[PDB]
Design a protein around this ligand. Structure first.
Ligand code: HEC
Ligand code: HEC
Ligand code: HEC
Ligand code: NO2
Ligand code: NO2
Ligand code: NO2
Ligand code: CU
Ligand code: CU
Ligand code: CU
Ligand code: CU
Ligand code: CU
Ligand code: CU
Lengths: 455, 455, 455
């Protein structure tokens, strides 16, 4: 027969359970081919792509990436696609792994309010991307319309202690990175493959802080990793560890002991990890400006005993992770909501700047503003800042070099410009500094920073 | 000895036959090393890169990609390169697979009207890119100067039912995608790696519609896939199938059962496919905006019996392929030629818009303009369009949201802007709508759309 | 135990020797695990990124890439990081291959004047990138803060005749490629992944001409290849040869007989080469505009007997390598220093243009300016140039087409524009032509070309 043909379906039809990221449906745990029924519903909706930044996502099952599907090589899959009547657009699905033109696209076209169905046999074992396939295909995929389908080998995968679901995507907003408000899709930036954000699981901090993945020393972790694109190839990397194994789609070839691996646009791989020592392990795109300037990091946090003979050093902090070392940045969300209301208090700006000050500023000036005598001027009880706080907006946007004196000490150094910070971010950071460590006090508005930018 | 040394050439010299894409010279089918003579002639010439879009290609043997060369590991290759006296530039060749500095570049320098020769032994088995190697190398390669050379293993490749030749390239026009006329090379866009088109076999639709590759259910297909670049890496993908095998250059490593595979700039791979069920199978760069916005699709069309137990669904259509589902878009070519002549009739604009309307517009408004009551307003006998057809130019360029009434029915939806359409494309699409389904009639000029763009 | 655990350290502590690129520390040549002490010192300093182009590099041990580290799987590594008191910034290190959060980042934070230490066991065999891990991480990496660490298998690597150290990086200057002076870092270009230079070993010509790598026919060469990024993936290619072997990090999978191989951002591979025939072998990023327009070439020069039966052709020259065929371009460095001094002589401009004229101009007009009668007009004793030398600035910046007459011969051809040349480059090239082959003489200033650009 064809390969993957294990005969016709036995027993009762199975209604497939799909999971929201970062979780995975359990092993099918069976020795016979089945008829599997899949209900998947498209929903269009605003969600936070970043703190105080809203985006209209188009989703399979309400999430980016969309719901995870798990079947067995040889299963017969009756695939129903519903387009929720709130949707303004039509949608369909192309599943990689499907043998058939469009991988289902033609038979799955679905207007708002309608349901579609088509049937396919899962001939090919492996991990596979699925995505919308509706003109214009790039826009559907950029708005979040992708996920994974696992087709298990008949004997199933080897048992591990944890299975997780992580999917990278490149996103195209009209506004610049961390510009606040509802951000429309930007076709220009997408055609040019110049994304404003590059994200795991549909948002900045989706898998950092309180939202990290978890395992214990001695446990094995399997991650199903997708690249939804639409455009970027991922230099997919784990910081501080190594993958025991990396297997692309249903490839016969299996790479072992690598830390860095290229994932094509539309590609998917299964990686295996064994926790050897505790701490935060970062998943990134090692096209480093994606990781550190566009949101492309996810954390795996390991619990257990130190092993001083393998690694003597300290847990990850804000020197490396910057503002994502913290549990969350809800203070930024809260301050942004207040601006929209017109009820922005000084305390709102202070708790938001406190969040944003980590790494961004603390790497030189320290957590406590103390600085380092002769090398990094203090921000704590600072005569320099007191003397002219309006110049602090210029110092942040445009930088500072030359000899200067601060609390009667000489500095001849360089503070790089930080023009990438948005007006609200400069304002809140500075309002926190002024209201910390016995400084003058007061406040800096977004409006004040806008004026100084424009000169 | 060296590896690949099977002794000196036996028998008479063989004059090598080269094929034009997408065809491949036949298997050398011999057990002895030979002296192979290769005559390859460079030609500069305008060809259509897209409908009504002309480009000055620099070519090896009159095609992009250039003529395919097939020899045997151990052969001695006497390589003659002629530069046609019409050429304005000098040219040479670097063949990957050649052991020797420049892979032939120095000894093959050839001014217009001249012939060059150099001899090399084919030590390395595999599939290899060749390209021009003349300062400035990027310009020669961007203008189309690349192809493939197969060096067979001594026992030859395994027999398959079909062998085809597909080569991706990134192209850099002064004008934007589908801007009509003769388009010069743009050095700025090339240096920035921002291509206007991304193409298989030197043009949009080179391998779609009437120009698809063909096989029958049960047949094996081998594709020799090149990436000429100059700059892009291809996330090379088959929609709706799987590659039995992928082998890069003359690599010992062979990947099996993958759908998605990274091809480096200057890389080449051999993929094997087995037809299981009939329909169109799309080859793409799954950096999706290349595939769907810049021309990076090719079709393999399979004939034979449905297998309802493997795949129940319908053949690919314009929901997914958009305007390339059709056999061709000659109507666009014909209307563009008419504009240049100043003899553009209403019928010319109508048949051109009819072509362009598929997917672009039909995905929401339907093939027949009917729309879907309450969800997608009709274009068919439309009071809304009748009431002010000049506003239709604004609706296409800039989009439409809000409550509206069309043939006495309420719509509160969103039609995305389509500013990417060129003036001629908006004009012809709208002229087709006006002259279809009992609408007012009339015509929209490119000149009319230009004015509305500029406001 | 863990894998790589060969017990506790025996014998005396070893003080590790680190080498500057392109050299490599010798094999550890031992059968027991050791305690290895590593002293590495960060230095900030201006160096030439290109002729007459200065950049403030941040370096590990004074070089880009930074000093090479060589230890044995199972060694215990006491890692000391010093930040020289001249530094204006703090720094730390993340080593790929380290089992531990941040791969050392947290425990290695080091202000100007300070020393840090942390200890790790080398559990994982392979070749690994190390880099700075200090907010903002992208800037530290773009300024040159990366190198390699080899962790040998216990039995060591196989013996080869030569081992070399080559590392690619993408660089982001405010000024355009080969714009002269001290060039600041450009955050905009880095975030957009639009590098101005793409370099092996921290500069244009770092490994070309007099600075090429060397081997003899019959010798094996191992290259440790790094991609520091920060952003680019390398289509890493050897022109005119083949890699016997390519192995990524400590991967079990080993590819054999390939010419072209993708290296991820942050990736590293070990390639093996065997010299079969003499000549220059070029290492490139086959994203060709990096190689030929941004500095991404390195040369391996092989000495020994011709083998006419394998390759009949000539050594690489300026048709392919352009201005890098020569031993150096010191004349460009010397002329640029003179402009800064205000002591720029006619002879300074002539020797600088002579350097720059190779490939750029000589590919059509020839080394001697003779041209080719009827095809390429001469520059040698040229009536056309004599008649109006001020028009030569326009011809270079903007090109020339149409019928023309030169030394009483007709030409109807096309000379492409060369607007990419900087004002100083046009001026020096033209001053060389005027003062060569019995031409009028005189000089063209950078200031003259600036005026003609602006019209
Ligand atoms: C190092 C990498 C720094 C980062 C990150 C930030 N700052 Fe800084 N800052 C730095 C230096 C070396 C200097 C002195 C420059 C000189 O000419 O010698 C400064 C200076 C300031 C000042 C003025 C002096 C003072 O008030 O003590 C201010 C107000 C200041 N810096 C604020 C500041 C903020 C708010 C930061 C993050 C947004 C920030 N700095 C980052 C070094 C570095
Ligand atoms: C959905 C994804 C659409 C595509 C693709 C195109 N159109 Fe559309 N159009 C769409 C909607 C939802 C609406 C109503 C918007 C609202 O505010 O509710 C429209 C509206 C129009 C109109 C005006 C109404 C009418 O005449 O019936 C016109 C003239 C129109 N659209 C034309 C049009 C053309 C020519 C298209 C391709 C070039 C096109 N539309 C694409 C939804 C979608
Ligand atoms: C071919 C690929 C060329 C390169 C590279 C360069 N030039 Fe050229 N040049 C070329 C042609 C075909 C022509 C004639 C154009 C026509 O209309 O037929 C020219 C012309 C000139 C001229 C004017 C004629 C003359 O003086 O002989 C000059 C002064 C000239 N070219 C200079 C020049 C320089 C300085 C170059 C490098 C910087 C250069 N050319 C490159 C073809 C080509
Ligand atoms: O390994 N860190 O980028
Ligand atoms: O599988 N389609 O993009
Ligand atoms: O093989 N040369 O680009
Ligand atoms: Cu969709
Ligand atoms: Cu896909
Ligand atoms: Cu050429
Ligand atoms: Cu090449
Ligand atoms: Cu640093
Ligand atoms: Cu790293």
């Amino acid at each position: 027969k064809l390969p993957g043909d294990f005969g016709p379906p036995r027993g009762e039809p199975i209604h497939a359970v799909l999971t929201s990221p970062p979780l995975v449906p359990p092993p099918v745990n069976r020795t016979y081919p089945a008829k599997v029924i899949v209900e998947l519903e498209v929903v269009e909706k605003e969600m936070q792509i970043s703190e105080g930044v809203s985006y209209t996502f188009w989703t399979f099952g309400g999430t980016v990436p969309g719901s995870f599907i798990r079947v067995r090589q040889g299963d017969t899959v009756e695939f129903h696609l519903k387009n929720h009547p709130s949707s303004k657009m039509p949608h369909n699905i192309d599943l990689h792994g499907v043998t058939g033109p469009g991988g289902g696209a033609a038979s799955s076209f679905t207007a708002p309010g309608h349901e579609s169905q088509f049937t396919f046999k899962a001939l090919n074992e492996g991990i596979y991307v699925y995505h919308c396939a509706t003109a214009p295909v790039g826009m559907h995929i950029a708005n979040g319309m992708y996920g994974l389908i696992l087709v298990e080998p008949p004997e199933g995968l080897p048992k591990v202690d944890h299975e997780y679901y992580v999917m990278q995507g490149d996103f195209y907003t009209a506004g610049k990175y961390r510009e606040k408000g509802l951000q429309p899709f930007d076709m220009e930036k997408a055609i040019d493959e110049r994304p404003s954000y590059v994200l795991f699981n549909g948002a900045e901090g989706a898998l950092t802080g309180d939202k990290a993945l978890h395992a214990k020393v001695g446990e094995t972790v399997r991650i199903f990793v997708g690249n939804g694109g639409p455009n970027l190839v991922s230099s997919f990397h784990v910081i501080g560890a190594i993958f025991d194994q990396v297997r692309y789609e249903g490839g016969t070839n299996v790479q072992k002991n690598v830390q860095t691996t290229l994932i094509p646009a539309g590609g998917a791989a299964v990686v295996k990890f064994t926790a050897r020592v505790p701490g935060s392990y970062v998943l990134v795109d090692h096209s480093i400006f994606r990781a550190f300037n566009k949101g492309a990091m996810a954390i795996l946090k390991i619990d257990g005993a130190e092993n001083k003979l393998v690694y003597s050093g300290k847990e990850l902090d804000s020197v490396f992770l910057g503002d994502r070392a913290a549990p969350n940045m809800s203070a930024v969300t809260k301050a942004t909501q207040a601006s929209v209301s017109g009820t922005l208090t000084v305390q709102d700006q202070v708790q938001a700047g406190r969040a944003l000050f980590a790494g961004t500023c603390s790497v030189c000036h320290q957590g406590n503003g103390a600085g380092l005598p002769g090398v990094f001027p203090p921000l704590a009880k600072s005569d320099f800042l007191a003397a002219d706080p309006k110049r602090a907006m210029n110092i942040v946007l445009h930088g500072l070099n030359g000899k200067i004196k601060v609390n009667g000490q000489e500095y001849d150094s360089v503070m790089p410009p930080m023009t990438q910070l948005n007006d609200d971010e400069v304002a809140n950071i500075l309002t926190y500094v002024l209201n910390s460590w016995d400084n003058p006090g007061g406040r800096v508005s977004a409006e004040d920073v806008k004026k100084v930018r424009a000169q």
